[PDB]
Design a protein around this ligand. Structure first.
Ligand SMILES: Nc1ccn([C@@H]2O[C@H](COP(=O)(O)OP(=O)(O)OP(=O)(O)O)[C@@H](O)[C@H]2O)c(=O)n1
Ligand SMILES: Nc1ccn([C@@H]2O[C@H](COP(=O)(O)OP(=O)(O)OP(=O)(O)O)[C@@H](O)[C@H]2O)c(=O)n1
Ligand SMILES: [Zn+2]
Ligand SMILES: [Zn+2]
Lengths: 310, 153, 310, 153, 310, 310
C-alpha cells in the first residue's frame, strides 16, 4: 500500500521529503496518462466554510478529472451550518458518515486537524486553515519548480513581497528546506519581513539566506522568483504608496534574468506584477495555477487508493 | 524532635508526598491536575515554614501512586518538587520532575483564532527547551509561544 | 411495478404501513449490496428554497451513490428565484420540464403538495415544508429503530424535549402509531407539551401514552429515547435556564438503561445531550444520520424504478 | 505545639478551624472563597475518617479570624459546619453558618441576557426561604431562580 | 428636598405607594400649569442602545417642554458605543462626566442598574431593560387610570393578551397591588398566562384575581380593560389563528361596558383592537400616549429639582 | 478680536504655542465660571460622516452648555449626503449657507481642509479626518496634562501602544514639542513604533527621547503615562498575544509611580488597562474625557465670539 494511503494531508511539516517526491512523481504521471475513472463511485465533500473560489474550482475539477462525485458548500455567506450551536466536531462526525474524503477550508487555524479527530477513517485534506497551512498550494508550487527547473535542490529562490503574513511563502520555505543546497533571497518591506522562526529554522539547518532591498540586486542569480501580494489593509494608504510600493515587477526588470528563471505568484495578483510581464517566457503564474490540477489529483489518488498502478 | 519541623506527624503508610512545592503552586496543582477527585485521605499544608527554602507547600495523598508522566507534568509549575512514594511507612523512591514531551489538557492556546477555544478538544502542546526558555507549540494552530505567554494566557 | 413507483412523497400520513415496510426493506438491501448505477442518466433537482445543509448534503450524496446527476440551488440568501413575481406554480412548471424528480425544502407549509399540481409526472419528494412534514427524516428514524431494535411494534419509546414545535417528534408519533403495541412516554416542559391532536389520535387508536417530568422515572423501561432540541428563542433566557433546562442527558443517567436502549436526535444537538454520552454504546445519533443515506436512496430507487430487482 | 496525628489533626496556635465540612465541598470552599491567598500557614485534611457524616473535610487557617458575615457565606455549601476560633490553643469561639441575606460574588446568574455576564461588577443575589428551599434573586436582572439552578450554573 | 430628588428610577418595585402618588400628583400640576424653563440649562443624554421611536420621542419632548437640552443616540446597525470591548460601564463612566441626567433603554436586563454604579451622582432613568422593567410606562398607565377613574384603589382591572411576556402587565400588576381593594381578571391564551410569581405575590397580600377565558365574560364588571399585543414570534401561526375566535376587541363587544370603562394599550395595537373601537368613548390608548409627556415631565422635574413649588 | 476669532481649526500644526495656551487658559475660565448663553442664537452643524459616539456627544454637549442650537447627522449605512456624485464641496457649499459653524469628522484625510475652501466665512472645526488630525483631542489632553502637572514643559511623558498608527500620539508629540524641556519615552512593539518623521522633527529641536521596551522600565521617572490601544486588525492574533507579556497596565506595575503621575487614554481602553487601575489615584482617563467639554467649549467660544471677557 503506498505511504499516503488514507492519511490526512493537514500540514506540510508532516510530509517528509519522500512523501513530497512520491506526490510529485504521481502528478507527473497523471499529467502524462489520465486516469479519469480511478475514483469512480467515490463521493467527496468539498466544505469551504470560508469561501475561496480559485481553490474550490480547482479542487473540484481535479475530483471530476479522476471520476469522483462531489457534494458540498461554499459559505462565509450564512448557508445554515453553525446555526443553533452545532460544534465543528459534530458537523464532521455527521459528514464523515457518508462521504469518502473531506476537503475543507476554514477561518480558524487548527480546524482541519481537529476534523481529523472526528472523521473516523475518512481522510481530511486541508485547503487552508486561517493563517496556518495550505499543503495543496505548496504541493503545486513545488511541482511547478520541479517541472520547470528539473530539480528541487540547489535552487536560488527569491521571495518577494509580504513575507510576514504570506501563509504560502512560509510553507514553501519550510518545504524547500527539506531539500539540499537551496539559497534564499528575501526582498520585503521592513514591516513585512520574514519572521524569525523561519529564519531560525533556516540557520539551524545550515541553509543560506540573505535580505535585499531590490530585485535587481539579485535577478542575475535567480531561478524561481516567487512574488506575493501586499494586502494594502496591512499598511496604511500612504505607507503602501510611499517608497515601499516597489516590490513590483515590470518586464524591463527581467533584462538579465537567466533563461530558466520563472516568476510564480499564488494569485490574485493585483498590481505587483505588471501586465507586460505576461508576454515574457518567464511568466509562469497561470501555468502554475494549471499545475494545481495535477498536484491535487495526485493527493486524492494516493489517499483513496491502496496500490496505485500506473 | 522540636525545632518544630513536623509536630505529631502525618506520616502515612502508603502514598505519594509531593514536597517542596514552591509556595502558591500548591493550590494550582490541585486545581489543574484535579488531585482532590478522590475519596482517599489527602492532607495539604500551605505556606509551610521551611526556613531552608523559605516557605513551601506540600500535598500528602494516601494509597495513591501518581507517576512517571504524571510527575513530569508538574515540571512546568513546580520545577523542583520531590515526589516521594511510600509503601509501608517510609520513602521507597524520591522522584524529581523532568520536563515532558507534551503537556496535554492543562494549558490554553494564546491564539484567539485557534479552534481549540470553541471545541470539545483537550489542549496539547509540544515542549521544546529552547535553551534559555521553553517554547510550546500548539497541536492545532501550530503556533509556537514562550511558555510564559502561555502560563499567563 | 412497485406501489411507490412515480408517487410523490409529500406526507407521512399518506404512506401506509406497507409503504413504510417496503421502503425500509429496500434501504436494508441497498445498505447490503450497492447499486451505484441504478439511476444512471437520471438528473435530479435539489431545490432548497430554505437552506438546510445537513439535509441537502445527505440527499445529494444519496443521489450520487445511485448514479444520478444533480442540479439545483440552496438559497434563503437571495439567489434570483422569486424575483419579478414568479409564482412557485411557475417555477415548478419550468423546472419539471427537464429533470426527472424534484427534491425540495421550502419555508411555507404546503409548498411540496402544491408543487405536485404543476410537476406533470415528475415526482416531488418533500425535504421539509415549514412546520408541516419531513417524511425523509421520519423514514431514517424508523429505519434506525428497526435496524437497532429488530422491530417497529411493541416498542417503549420516550420523547423528550420540545414536543410542541418539534416537527419530527409529531410525525414519528404518527408513523409509530401505524404499528402495534407501542407505548409512549412524553417528557417535555409544560410550555412545550405534545399537542392535543397527537394525543387525541393516540387515544382514539387505543395506544398507551403517559407524561413524566424526568427521564429517570422511565429509563429502565425504555427502548428508543428520542431527544429534541429546545430552541431558546421559544422561551425567554431566564425560562430556559430556570428548572425547565433539565431535559438534558448526561452519561451518568444511562446507568440502568436496557442493553438495547438507543438515544436518537435529529440534530444539531447543542447541549441537550452532553458530550460524554457519545462514548456510551447507546449513543446512536450519528449512526442515525448515516442511515439517512439509505432511507433517501431507497425512496429515490423505488420512485424512479418500475420494478426494482435486487 | 500539641499531639497532631492526621486522622483528626491537632492544634494551631490561634486561628480558624472550619470543621464538619460535608465532603468534596472543602476544596470547593478553598476555590470559591479564595482562602488561599494569605502567606499564613493553612493546614487542610481531606476525606477524613469521622465527624458524623462518616467522612468529612477540615481547613485550619492560623492567625486569620474570618467572621460572622464570612461564616455565613459558607451556609449554601457547608451549613453543617462549625467555625472554631482559637487563641492560645483553646477554642475561645464556636459558631455555625446561618443563611445570609445577600451572597455576593460567588454565583452566576443563570439568565443569559443578564448584563452581569459581560461587565466589571460582582454578582449579587438576594436570598430568601430558609431550608424548605432557597430562592436567589439577581441584583441586576431581578429574576428569581432556584438555588438548585444557580448552584448548578 | 422632595423624596425623589437625585434618585435613580430603575424598577417599579423600588418605589413605594407614596412615591407613585407624588409623581402622579406632580404630573397633574405640570399638565395644568406648564413650567417651560424649569430645567433651563440642564443637558439630558437620551442613550437608546435599543431603538424605540415612540418612547424616545415622548421622552425628548418631555425634556424639551421643561426647557432642557438633549444629546443622545438610538441604534440599529450604527453608532459606535458599546461596539465590543467598550463596556457599558465605561460608556456610562464617560457620559456621566458630560450630562446632568441619563435616560437609557438597552436590550439586556439590569443595564440601567449596572449604569447606576458608574454614573456618579448623575441620576439614571430606565426606559426599558430587556424583559425586566419599564417604570415610566407604568407611571403613565397609572396616571391614565387615576384621571379616568378618579382613584387607584378598588378597581376591577381586566388584563388581556400575552400576560406571560408583556413586561408592562407585570409592572402594572405590581404597582396596582400597592393600592387597596383592586380585583384582577386575567384573560390570556393558557400558553401565555400570568407567571406564578405575580400570582403568588398577589395572594400573599390577599388580592383577588381570577383567570378568564374571554373578555365577553368580564365586560360588564370592568373599569380598566388593559389590552396587550400578542407576539406572533412566540407562537406558531396556526395556534395564533386558533384561539377561540381571538381575544381581539371590536365595538360589538363593548355594547355591555360600563360608562366609565376605558380600553388602554401600551401600543402598537396592530390587530387586537379594531378601528371601530377608536371612535367609541371607551377608547383611551392615544390619550394614554399623550399622558406619557406629563408622567415623564413629573419624574424629570422631581429628580433634577430639589423642591418644586407648583 | 481674539487671535482665533473666525479661524478654522484643522491641524495642530497650524496653531502656535501661544494659541494652544490661549485655548487652555479659556477652558479653565469656562470650567470655573460657566457662561450658558454665550452662543445663544448660534446654530452649529455636527456633520459626522464617520460615526464616533463619544466625540459626537462631547461636542454637542459643548455646543449646548454655551447655549447653541445643533443640527447635524452621523452615518453608518444611512443618511443621504455624499451618496455618490454629491461632492463633499457641494455638501459644504450648501450647509455653509444654513449654519454659523461646522464641526465635522470624515474618513478621508484633509476632508476638513477641503471644506475650509467651500464654507465661505463659516469656520470649520475638525473632529477627525482619516489618519491625519484630531486637534480637539490634543487640546483636551494638554488641558489634562496642565491641570494635573501644573505646566506643559519639562515633563517626562511616556507614550505606549500603537505609536505607528495612533493619530492622537502623533499630534500630542507635535504639540508638546512646542513647549520646552520635555523628555519623551516611547514604549511600542517594534512592529508599531514612532514614525521616523516624529523622531526626525524631535531631533531638529534638540528634544530628548528614548525608546523603551516595557513601562516597568520607565515607571519611576514619569509624570504622564499616555496609553494607546493596540489595533488587533494590524496584527496577527498570535503576534498580538506574544509581545513580552504585553504592555498592558495593571495596578501592580504602578507600585513604583510618582505621586503626581497620571495614566491617560483617549479611550476605548478594552484590555490594555485593567479595572484595578481605575481605583488607584493615578487613573485619569475619565476625568480626561470630562475635560473634553471644557476644551471644546473654549475653542467654540473663541471662534464664534470676537472678544471674550471672562
Ligand atoms: N512514613 C512517612 C515517611 C515519609 N513521609 C514524608 O515523605 C517526605 C520524604 O522526605 P525524606 O526523604 O523522608 O527526608 P527529606 O529531607 O524531607 O526529603 P527531601 O530531601 O526531598 O526534602 C517527607 O516530607 C515526609 O513527610 C511521610 O509522610 N510518611
Ligand atoms: N488549638 C486547637 C484546638 C482544637 N483544634 C480543632 O478544633 C476543632 C473543634 O474544637 P473542639 O470544640 O475542641 O472539639 P469538639 O468538641 O469535637 O468541637 P465539635 O463538637 O463542634 O466537633 C477540632 O477539629 C480540633 O482539631 C485545633 O485544631 N487546634
Ligand atoms: Zn492553538
Ligand atoms: Zn441576573
Amino acid at each position: 500500500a503506498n505511504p499516503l494511503y488514507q492519511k490526512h494531508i493537514i500540514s506540510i511539516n508532516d510530509l517528509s521529503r519522500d512523501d513530497l517526491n512520491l506526490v510529485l512523481a504521481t502528478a507527473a504521471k497523471l499529467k502524462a496518462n489520465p486516469q479519469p475513472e480511478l475514483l469512480k463511485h467515490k463521493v467527496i465533500a468539498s466544505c469551504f466554510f470560508e469561501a475561496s473560489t480559485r481553490t474550490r474550482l480547482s479542487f473540484e475539477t481535479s475530483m471530476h478529472r479522476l471520476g469522483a462525485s462531489v457534494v458540498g458548500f461554499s459559505d462565509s455567506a450564512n448557508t445554515s451550518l453553525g446555526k443553533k450551536g452545532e460544534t465543528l466536531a459534530d458537523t464532521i462526525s455527521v459528514i464523515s458518515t457518508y462521504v469518502d474524503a473531506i476537503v475543507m477550508r476554514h477561518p480558524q487555524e487548527g480546524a482541519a486537524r481537529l476534523a481529523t479527530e472526528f472523521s473516523g477513517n475518512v481522510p481530511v485534506l486541508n485547503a487552508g486553515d486561517g493563517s496556518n497551512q495550505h499543503p495543496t498550494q505548496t504541493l503545486l508550487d513545488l511541482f511547478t519548480i520541479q517541472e520547470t527547473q528539473g530539480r528541487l535542490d540547489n535552487l536560488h529562490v527569491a521571495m518577494v513581497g509580504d513575507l510576514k503574513y504570506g501563509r504560502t511563502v512560509h510553507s514553501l520555505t519550510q518545504a524547500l528546506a527539506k531539500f539540499d543546497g537551496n539559497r534564499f533571497y528575501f526582498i520585503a518591506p521592513d514591516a513585512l519581513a520574514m519572521p524569525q522562526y523561519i529564519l531560525d529554522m533556516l540557520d539551524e539547518k545550515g541553509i543560506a539566506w540573505s535580505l535585499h532591498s531590490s530585485i535587481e540586486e539579485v535577478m542575475a542569480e535567480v531561478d524561481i522568483l516567487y512574488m506575493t501580494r501586499v494586502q494594502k489593509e496591512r499598511l496604511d494608504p500612504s505607507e503602501y504608496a510611499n517608497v515601499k510600493a516597489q516590490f513590483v515587477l515590470r518586464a524591463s526588470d527581467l533584462h538579465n534574468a537567466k533563461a530558466n528563471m520563472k516568476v510564480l505568484h499564488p494569485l490574485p495578483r493585483v498590481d505587483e506584477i505588471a501586465t507586460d510581464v505576461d508576454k515574457t517566457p518567464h511568466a509562469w503564474y497561470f501555468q502554475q495555477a494549471g499545475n494545481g490540477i495535477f498536484a491535487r489529483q495526485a493527493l486524492l489518488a494516493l489517499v483513496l487508493n491502496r496500490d496505485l498502478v500506473l | 524532635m522540636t525545632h518544630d519541623n513536623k509536630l505529631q506527624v502525618e506520616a502515612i503508610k502508603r502514598g505519594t508526598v509531593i514536597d517542596h512545592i514552591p509556595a502558591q503552586i500548591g493550590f494550582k496543582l490541585l486545581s489543574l491536575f484535579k488531585l482532590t477527585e478522590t475519596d482517599q485521605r489527602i492532607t495539604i499544608g500551605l505556606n509551610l515554614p521551611s526556613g531552608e527554602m523559605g516557605r513551601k507547600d506540600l500535598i500528602k495523598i494516601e494509597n495513591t501512586f501518581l507517576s512517571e508522566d504524571q510527575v513530569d507534568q508538574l515540571a512546568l509549575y513546580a520545577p523542583q518538587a520531590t515526589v516521594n512514594r511510600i509503601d509501608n511507612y517510609e520513602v521507597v523512591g524520591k522522584s524529581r520532575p523532568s520536563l515532558p514531551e507534551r503537556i496535554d489538557n492543562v494549558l490554553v492556546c494564546p491564539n484567539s483564532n485557534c479552534i481549540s477555544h470553541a471545541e470539545p478538544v483537550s489542549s496539547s502542546f509540544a515542549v521544546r527547551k529552547r535553551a534559555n526558555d521553553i517554547a510550546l507549540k500548539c497541536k492545532y494552530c501550530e503556533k509556537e509561544f514562550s511558555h510564559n505567554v502561555v502560563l499567563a494566557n
